[PDB]
Amino acid sequence: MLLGSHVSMSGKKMLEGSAIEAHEYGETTFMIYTGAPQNTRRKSIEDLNITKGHEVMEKYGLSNIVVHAPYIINIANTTKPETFNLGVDFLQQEIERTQAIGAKDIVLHPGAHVGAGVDAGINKIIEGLNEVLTNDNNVRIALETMAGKGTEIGRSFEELARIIDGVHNNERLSVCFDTCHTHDAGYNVKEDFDGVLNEFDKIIGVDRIKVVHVNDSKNDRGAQKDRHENIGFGYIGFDALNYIVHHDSFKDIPKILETPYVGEDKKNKKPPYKLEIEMLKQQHFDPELKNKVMQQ
Ligand SMILES: [Fe+3]
Ligand SMILES: [Fe+3]
Ligand SMILES: [Zn+2]
């Protein structure tokens, strides 16, 4: 079972710390940002501490790890050229970092059209990806399914297919399927997950899903709000998320929790991943999970 979470990529230990943390939570894979998720500031490849990170991954049975690009990348931005240019430059550097880390995919939010409209934004993403994937290398960009909050592009499989169709080196594209995002966009992942996969197979191809993000939602189907919830405590629920986690279509695809920390206040937030993974491995919902996460 290839199941883990977002983990830290910080401090002196960098990737070694990621691997230690993933093992702490009983993971077999994990996802990192290559630095702060909120910016493009990054340490040198040497300071990512990759050789030691790989040694700890080998010791603890961690494989198939994932990189996520910072959430501030917006290569759909048609009216702020410094933002577009920074996104292109950053992603070229991220591909080099990711090759060194040994992840197959960089998860990328396609972007936000910020009032220029979907057509202009998709054309801009295509332009940016054509700049980024010009260089040869096998790391893929995994376009994330998005909730459709604000001016996000990627709320439908059709929007993702338009980007894939426009990019020249489109073999270097994959998809990251996020259960919260697809639910919030309106896909019936709770009660018709196989129907959602069949729609995905028609439009894109399920073989292109190279990362799965496993998140419940604080909102009902179609709400377009993108507020993650702990596994089984939201509007998708345990049975549906457990079904997705164990689904044969995803057997050799890393599954990554991005669920919220639990705490009595923001100074006491604790990670839920260890207990969520235990629950998913047992295939039995634990109503006490939030109470127990706070007690860790
Ligand atoms: Fe994301
Ligand atoms: Fe996600
Ligand atoms: Zn989200």
Query: Residue 213 annotated as binding?
Result: yes
Q: How many CB atoms lie within 10 A of CB 202?
A: 11
254 CA → ligand 2 middle, Å: 13
Q: Over the Cα atoms of the chain, what is R_g?
A: 18
d(CA 20, CA 179): 26
228 CA → ligand 1 middle, Å: 11
By the CB criterion, residues less than 5 angstroms from ion ligand 2 are: 178, 213, 258
Angle, alpha carbons 190-196-198 (nearest 5°): 145
CATH class of 4-295: alpha beta
* CA torsion through residues 270, 247, 140, 74, sign: negative
d(CA 16, CA 224): 36
The amino acid at residue 63 is S
d(CA 148, CA 240): 21
Residue 2 CB contacts under 8 Å (≥ 6 apart), including other chains? 28, 29, 63, 64, 252, 253, 254, 255
Query: Residue 178 annotated as binding?
Result: yes
188: buried, middle or exposed (CB in 10 Å: 19+, 13-18, 0-12)? Answer: middle
Q: How many CB atoms lie within 10 A of CB 204?
A: 21
> Do residues 112 and 80 make contact, with C-beta atoms less than 8 angstroms apart?
no
Residue with tokens 């896909």: 187
d(CA 79, CA 269): 38
* Helices (H), ranges, the chain: 15-24, 50-60, 81-101, 118-132, 157-166, 179-185, 193-203, 238-245, 273-282, 289-294
Four-point Cα dihedral 138, 10, 110, 27, nearest 10: 70
181 CA → ligand 3 middle, Å: 6
* Neighbouring-strand partners of residue 252: none
Tokens of 72: 């501030």
> Do residues 12 and 43 make contact, with C-beta atoms less than 8 angstroms apart?
no
Ligand nearest to the CA of 217: 3
| Domain-wise residue ranges, the chain | 4-295
The amino acid at residue 230 is N
**Greatest Cα pair distance in the chain:** 51
285 CA → ligand 2 middle, Å: 22
**Final resolution, Å:** 1.0
* Helices (H), ranges, 167-272: 179-185, 193-203, 238-245
- SS3 state of residue 37: coil
d(CA 255, CA 247): 11
51: buried, middle or exposed (CB in 10 Å: 19+, 13-18, 0-12)? Answer: exposed
144 CA → ligand 2 middle, Å: 7
> Do residues 181 and 214 make contact, with C-beta atoms less than 8 angstroms apart?
no
The amino acid at residue 205 is G
Residue 58 CB contacts under 8 Å (≥ 6 apart), including other chains? none
161 CA → ligand 2 middle, Å: 18
> Do residues 14 and 49 make contact, with C-beta atoms less than 8 angstroms apart?
yes
* Neighbouring-strand partners of residue 262: 270
State the structure-solving technique. Answer: X-ray
Q: How many CB atoms lie within 10 A of CB 101?
A: 24
Tokens of 203: 């439009």
Q: How many CB atoms lie within 10 A of CB 221?
A: 17
The amino acid at residue 146 is M
Tokens of 167: 């990019």
66's enclosing H/E stretch is strand 66-68
d(CA 159, CA 165): 10
The amino acid at residue 180 is C
d(CA 83, CA 113): 12
d(CA 195, CA 275): 30
109 CA → ligand 2 middle, Å: 9
